[PDB]
Amino acid sequence: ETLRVDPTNDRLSALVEIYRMMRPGEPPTREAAESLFENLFFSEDRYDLSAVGRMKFNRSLLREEIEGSGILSKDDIIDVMKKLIDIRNGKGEVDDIDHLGNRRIRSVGEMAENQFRVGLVRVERAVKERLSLGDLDTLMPQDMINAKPISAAVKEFFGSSQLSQFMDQNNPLSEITHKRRISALGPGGLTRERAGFEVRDVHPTHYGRVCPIETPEGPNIGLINSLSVYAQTNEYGFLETPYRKVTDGVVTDEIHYLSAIEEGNYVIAQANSNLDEEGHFVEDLVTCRSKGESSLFSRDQVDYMDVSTQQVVSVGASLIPFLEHDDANRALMGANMQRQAVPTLRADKPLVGTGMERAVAVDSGVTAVAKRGGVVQYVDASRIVIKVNEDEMYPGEAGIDIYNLTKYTRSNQNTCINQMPCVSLGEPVERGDVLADGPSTDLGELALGQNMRVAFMPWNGYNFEDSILVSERVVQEDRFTTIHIQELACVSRDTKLGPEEITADIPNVGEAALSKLDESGIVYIGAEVTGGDILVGKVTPKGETQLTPEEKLLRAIFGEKASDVKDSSLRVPNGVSGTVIDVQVFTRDGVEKDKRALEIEEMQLKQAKKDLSEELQILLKHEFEKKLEAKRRKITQGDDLAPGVLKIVKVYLAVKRRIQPGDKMAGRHGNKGVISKINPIEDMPYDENGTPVDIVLNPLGVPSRMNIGQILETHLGMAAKGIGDKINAMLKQQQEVAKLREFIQRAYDLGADVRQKVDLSTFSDEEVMRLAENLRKGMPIATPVFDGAKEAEIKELLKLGDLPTSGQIRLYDGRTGEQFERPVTVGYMYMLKLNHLVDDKMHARSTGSYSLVTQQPLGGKAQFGGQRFGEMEVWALEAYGAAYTLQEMLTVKSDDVNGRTKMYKNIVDGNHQMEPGMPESFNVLLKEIRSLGINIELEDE
Amino acid sequence: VYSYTEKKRIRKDFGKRPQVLDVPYLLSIQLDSFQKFIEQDPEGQYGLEAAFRSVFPIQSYSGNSELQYVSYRLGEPVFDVQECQIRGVTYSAPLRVKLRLVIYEREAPEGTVKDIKEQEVYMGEIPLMTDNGTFVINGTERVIVSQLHRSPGVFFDSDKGKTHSSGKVLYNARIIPYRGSWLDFEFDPKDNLFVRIDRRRKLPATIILRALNYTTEQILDLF
Amino acid sequence: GRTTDPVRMYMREMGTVELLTREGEIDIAKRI
């Protein structure tokens, strides 16, 4: 029937028909049509199924050759048509587009290679065109090729592309979870606007390859998936996950990485399956999943078993203790939130973790890890020096390692990156040991927040919907305080009226305002500035001011002169108040350096010599001196700045944000919350011992959203702290080594058969005391994701300490001293400070700058702009009778140019009346419709 | 066995399933990909070598003057990572490619060449990956996120009866390359097979068959 | 078929005239 409807009769007619389809209007011709068809699919230059493409093509056609060619053939096309026909009638299955055996993974190397090849083709075009006229001795292979296209392509990819983004750096976990992030968007993928639900949905093939919960909720949900903990990538780019091979009945320890399409062909046992100490399943019927579904299978039926119970989740999802007790929505929220925790002043530790904190802390290069074992030779806040053990020493070298710690620097999110040593002098360290603690890390453990004594009770509406009541002791201990380094640049350019200057002479500012600036006009280092103070003093030349009358007169009266320079000094933003910790000066090559630039340069040169000289002293002389001349030349070489800009001064401010109502806190279980009140320590609930609770959380938050993990986390949290408290006592009275060893050993055993064994007998008395001192703040506990601590074990640990196993104590009102009825749940919960500080979100405006084409206020808080009173707000005003409110909102407060100045004046003299007028945007619309050939006018003028 | 930094403070461990495979390096996905891109292998499989081999050799149309690629190397970065962050620059390595311009003597189909000009030339600066999977591009640390995209090959994706009344299933095949145009086959409700190229106007499928130098008789012989 | 591309229409209209024959340009200059 296709032939019946087919209009063509010969090959040339078909070629011209497809030519008319491809290039309508262009008359079809023999040679052109032939070339077009031969270039579509059968020319290697303009068509390529990659090796993976050929492999998938040959697999889908049931061929037995995994390799082949990159261009299509007659056989390939005809076989595709034949299989389509077979699917139409025979037994054919629609391919699942969302199958992870059908979706490939592209990484940075591949995409960069593709864009480099794009640059190469667009340089070869020029190379060929130039070669069109071959020469003998006038051209070289340096003039036929231009680097600009290749550089432009590479820079366009790496700088301005959807798949290359600013690195989320407010956390170790945020960095690590950004680096292993999968996105279906970008050039070659879908679009968030028209992706479609089916692609967003979780697939049974995501199991162990793509996390089911770690994904952003919003416009692009299910399109920004994150890689699972154990997931890998094929040579071809398909995600594969590990499994332990099962013989007849023995679970072997050999690991096979199975891809999605291979996963169906076997039945895979669960990680929550038992083994009788020899590899055999205890139960004769085990739960498996064969093809999408799961069922029970005989012991002698399974080919594979899950490598671990953690392998379904991502790294962030696998840091949530008691995840299995949390609703999937709330777990999604919890992972997303803990990606946003701000590093506080002192990283505490998770008192209740999952055991994945060490992996995240070390794998992300936020700490300093020993490259080679040895004995610590010198420790300082800024560096560590290791004397390598001779076993790891290479013959031709000095066995010394110098780790230079990153001191207070700025992250992409304006947080504080700072590395502190975590070792003492003369201590033995082995390869892979943590030597310094980066931001939000405690002895190599990821420490995103603080473990706080929380009580679950209402307390007077101060935690009403999700609000949080916080004690003043929490603020006093500065345990949710953060450092927020920020850059501020003053750039002096070359203007037409004259070059800009960074002098310290600034008109219309008194002696005191310029006290913080040195002679060269730049603030001092360490100076505590306030919102409004000058940082860099700058002045721009100006002329032909065109003074008005009754101002010429005033200047004449006071014998004053109008300055020929206007003030353009860099001032501290209003509200911000920190200390100046760093100043950088970038001077153009030709310009002459100022006093402060020269002073900075000498400090950098001496520092450079000091670092190089110390390196040689600690540890070669030829490389030392050669590097000193290179380092010296780099320090004074002069900076390649933008065109016109004469000199750049960057000032780094260091703020300290403590805590306040409006700051968003969160636990790891999706329990959000904004601090509402900060309470005096004598107003907080307290227990029989007079110890107040740090935070009070509403218990009505828990039941509606089934995140029970937090409650569990609280109980275990209490239990953990309990152990520490006991240890604390045994350390305040110098009891003995034996008693501490016995109690700590008893605390590590705890009943149920746990895979972890700790024998304190091999711990020397000195080591046991160090362990006890590290455990006096609480006993850290690991509760793996789906293999956590059972409730009975929590009760047993609560019993080891003298805490009740119900998890609830009787609390008293600090206000009245009366016992709260109905004992309340108190414990320790890991609270995080999220990067949603009310410092950065409060914003107000009376009048300010206005938009250019439409005479309306501007955007939010960076241009000091106003709030959008959108269309739905207008509807709300209309539904009320508020017609004067609405009119003033859309005429005098926004758009009427003459109206808003009159309103400002009228308010100034206490006459709260307006002359509304016509908004300027309607005038713009009238001129725009008239700018088409449409005559629109106002009647009855 | 307890490492020194873990002997200081041991985390009590619940959980009963023994560990058989430890967590891999968490940043392998980025580091391995960029290593394969930047490192040069003695094969055209991966990276800049693959790109050069795939397109860099060039022949002057009707002139038979050739420009061929020998090897490449990455020059030392001018600045370190920290200096790039401070000044504001892309942590990049220069790309120096060895090229050879071979000139063929006129009327030499055998391959006799006049001369060869072998010179090393500069082809842009490629941004480098720091030790932790990041790129500093203009002094700011950037991350390139891996993309999950439809794999090349043939896919059969009949609609679910959402097109025509009675919910008839119209089957289709689609060839997706890495580079090139798309080639779709589809069915209409009247049970006819139609070819479509780069998602343009529909055509009867047999047209493509005729375009491949097939007659009606052998077409029916095939199908 | 049909197209809206102005460049395609220009190509259509201009390509109709045969390019030239040597000694034809000389005769055209002669006519000028």
Swiss-Prot record, chain B:
Domain of life according to the entry: Bacteria
Entry comment on modification after translation: Acetylated on several lysine residues in the presence of glucose.
Use case: Co-administration of salinamide and rifampicin or salinamide and myxopyronin suppresses the emergence of resistance to both antibiotics.
Subunit details: The RNAP catalytic core consists of 2 alpha, 1 beta, 1 beta' and 1 omega subunit. When a sigma factor is associated with the core the holoenzyme is formed, which can initiate transcription. The rRNA transcription and antitermination complex (rrnTAC) consists of RNAP, NusA, NusB, NusE (rpsJ), NusG, SubB, ribosomal protein S4, DNA and precursor rRNA; S4 is more flexible than other subunits. In pull-down experiments interacts with CedA.
Similarity comment: Belongs to the RNA polymerase beta chain family.
Function: DNA-dependent RNA polymerase (RNAP) catalyzes the transcription of DNA into RNA using the four ribonucleoside triphosphates as substrates.
Protein name: DNA-directed RNA polymerase subunit beta
Gene (name only): rpoB
Swiss-Prot record, chain C:
Domain comment, as recorded: Contains 4 domains, connected by flexible linkers. In the active conformation, the domains are in an extended conformation, each making extensive interactions with the RNA polymerase catalytic core.
Chain's role: Sigma factors are initiation factors that promote the attachment of RNA polymerase to specific initiation sites and are then released. This sigma factor is the primary sigma factor during exponential growth. Preferentially transcribes genes associated with fast growth, such as ribosomal operons, other protein-synthesis related genes, rRNA- and tRNA-encoding genes and prfB.
Designated name of the protein: RNA polymerase sigma factor RpoD
Subcellular location: Cytoplasm
Entry's family note: Belongs to the sigma-70 factor family. RpoD/SigA subfamily.
Subunit structure of this chain's protein: Interacts transiently with the RNA polymerase catalytic core formed by RpoA, RpoB, RpoC and RpoZ (2 alpha, 1 beta, 1 beta' and 1 omega subunit) to form the RNA polymerase holoenzyme that can initiate transcription. Identified in a complex containing RpoD, the RNA polymerase subunits RpoA, RpoB and RpoZ, CRP and DNA. Interacts with Rsd; this prevents interaction with the RNA polymerase catalytic core and with promoter DNA, and as a consequence, promotes transcription from promoters that require alternative sigma factors.
Gene responsible for this protein: rpoD
